[model samples]
Target: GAITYDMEIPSSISAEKMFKAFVLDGDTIIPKALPHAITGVQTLEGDGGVGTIKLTTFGEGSVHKSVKHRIDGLDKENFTYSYSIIEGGALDVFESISYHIKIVATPDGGCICKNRSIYTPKCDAQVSEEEIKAGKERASGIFKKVEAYLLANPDC
Candidate 1:
């Protein structure tokens, strides 16, 4: 069975800036957003393209040691990114996890940061609404941190 969730966070940052920060330079920008919780991100393999594998390392006050992600798809022109979580605390209760992100302009002069998560389980599996909510909250929190950073700097 598969479970999918979509999260949309409002932001004033342009789609290009959001894409660059969250997708292209995540390894660089995230640490600045939460230096204590996120030490850094490393590209384990590939040249930051599809099939590239990245490792996001955590520091003190973090719940997980690290998470490994493989980039599956990226569309720069469309401002869409997709990746899979092959190993990490996120997959502790599942077989595999994947995510997709897209930024859309809103009529209110804010952009909607859209995120989708697909959870694939091993054998027979059941994930409760609360479990999915917990994951969404965690992911959204990080997005918000970055959003706040962009808002403060504006030059980013």
Candidate 2:
């Protein structure tokens, strides 16, 4: 079985700026802004630029999972960014997955963000539909917060 999730968050910001804000080192943004929730987003390989290997750590007690993500592709022309799953325990069950984000500037000069999750189920006994939906909700919240931050501080 395969699973895909789409999420959209519109903001009064430019696509270029929002994409930059999302890809930029989370240490410089997310972790700092949401320290209590996000412990850190550390870089494992390459510069914290377009193509970077990242590990995101969250939670303070029992809830903790660090999913390793590899920057696979980036295109400013279409405002799309892609990342592959190179190392991860909980998320490794999927045959293959690439989480991507796309930002499109609307006619009103506002930004429309879209995310695509590409994954194949591993034997169909790992996770349920409700679990996947919950993942989307959580990730969507993070994306929305990121969008809000960018809208407030465009220079980041």
Question: For candidate 1, lDDT tens digit of each residue in 9-41?
Answer: 787778767756664567766666556667887
Instruction: Supply the TM-score for candidate 2.
Output: 0.75
Q: List the residue pairs that clash in candidate 1.
A: none
List RMSD in Å for every model shown. Answer: 3.4, 3.1
Cα deviation of 129, candidate 1, in Å: 4.8
Who wins the TM-score comparison? 2
Please identify model 1 stretches exceeding 4 Å from their true place. Answer: 28-40, 46-48, 58-64, 76-78, 88-92, 107-109, 128-131, 154-156
Off by over 4 Å in 2: 28-38, 48-50, 60-64
Clashes of 2: 0
- Structure candidate 2, residue pairs in collision: none
lDDT of each: 0.74, 0.65
Tens digit per residue, CA lDDT, model 2, 9-105: 7766666666555645455565655455466677777754556787877665313366677777778777898877766654656666677888777
